[PDB]
Amino acid sequence: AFAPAADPGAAWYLLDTSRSLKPLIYQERMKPSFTSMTKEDDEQV
């Protein structure tokens, strides 16, 4: 003892590594399914 941070970049390990488990996928509900849009007012989530 705001909190800055000093990080190297030369080493091929970079701080705060990320893991992209799966590529971004856009899901939808155009299919004739789901309750909150049929039973309940349309939501077309």
Partner 1 sequence: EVEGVFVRATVERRCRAGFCFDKEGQGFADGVLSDEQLEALESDPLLKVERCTFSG
41 binds, among partner 1, its own copies, none (CB under 5 to 8 A by kind): partner 1
Residues 12-31 that bind its own copies (CB under 8 A): 27, 29, 31
Shortest Å, Cβ 20 to its own copies: 18
How far apart (Å, rounded) are the C-alpha atoms in residues 38 and 30?
12
In angstroms, the CA 30 to CA 42 distance is 11
Q: Of these partners, its own copies, partner 1, none, which one is at the site of residue 42 (CB under 5 to 8 Å by kind)?
A: none
Could you tell me which of 6, 12, 43 has the C-alpha nearest to residue 28? 43
- For its own copies, the binding residues (CB under 8 A) are 27, 29, 31-36, 38, 45
